[PDB]
Structure formats: C-alpha cells, structure tokens
Ligand SMILES: CC(=O)N[C@@H]1[C@@H](O)[C@H](O[C@@H]2O[C@H](CO)[C@H](O)[C@H](O)[C@H]2NC(C)=O)[C@@H](CO)O[C@@H]1O
C-alpha cells in the first residue's frame with residue numbers, strides 16, 4: 281500500500297486527454313477522502329467525499345485560491361462505500377475535469393484555474409488504503 285497522504289507529480293501540469301487513475305479501498309468507518317489537484321499552494325480541483333456530514337454522504341468539490349476556498353459544488357450521488365475497493369478516473373477535458381468512479385460517470389468540475397500546465401501535483405489523502413495512483417494520455 282502507498283503511504284497516505286501521497287503526492288503524485290504531474291509533470292508540466294495537466295492537459296486535455298490526460299487521464300489520472302486512483303485505485304484504493306475505503307477504510308472501515310471512513311470519514312473523508314480527498315483528491316487535491318494543486319497549482320503551487322492553490323488547489324485547482326478539490327474532490328472531497330464526506331461520509332458523515334450531518335449523517336449524510338456528499339461529495340464536496342471546490343477550488344482554493346490564495347488560501348481561500350471558493351463556492352462549493354456538491355454532488356449527492358455517492359458511489360463510495362466504507363470497506364470497499366474503488367477506482368477514481370479523472371479525465372482532463374478542455375472545459376472541465378470529468379470524474380468517473382467504478383466506470384460510471386459521477387460529475388464534472390469546470391476549470392476555475394486556467395493555467396492547466398501549472399497544476400503540477402495531485403495530493404491524495406484521507407481514510408483509504410491507497411493501491412496505486414497513475415496517469416496516461418488517451
Ligand atoms: C455547508 C458549508 O458550506 N460547509 C463549509 C465547509 O465545507 C468548509 O470546510 C472546508 O471545505 C473545503 C471545501 O470547500 C475543504 O473540504 C476543507 O478541507 C474544509 N475544511 C475543514 C476544516 O473541514 C468550512 C471551512 O471552509 O466552511 C463551511 O463550514
């Protein structure tokens with residue numbers, strides 16, 4: 281198992297047709313998982329499954345600029361389950377990050393950070409056993 285939190289360098293940032301794949305298993309009684317696509321200290325795309333926000337499960341997505349979180353985008357469709365293996369695929373498209381979980385489309389997140397080639401790290405954190413994190417150009 282990879283050590284969490286895990287940093288995956290994205291050399292030269294991201295670009296349309298880059299596909300990032302995260303394989304792992306949610307811990308029992310998980311609280312949160314997070315993917316942070318970072319541009320330096322900024323977070324271009326934060327993808328944050330929350331397993332117990334007021335006894336509901338929700339995915340919170342956002343951007344952090346100059347240390348300030350912006351307007352959250354919330355998705356109530358929640359494909360993760362404590363104790364179970366998952367696959368997250370993040371496909372960079374011209375206008376958005378497109379996320380599928382377990383081969384089913386989940387959400388899109390419009391690019392707020394415009395300098396895609398400066399989004400050069402992916403941080404993976406939270407209540408998972410992390411099996412692998414990789415990228416490929418499709
Ligand atoms: C309903 C609502 O607006 N809740 C927010 C809450 O989600 C937010 O918590 C932060 O949210 C960002 C994403 O927007 C990250 O997930 C942060 O990790 C998370 N910070 C903490 C300490 O959990 C807080 C703080 O911005 O403000 C509202 O409560």
Ligand SMILES: [Cl-]
Nearest residue numbers: 392393394395
């Ligand atoms: Cl930008």
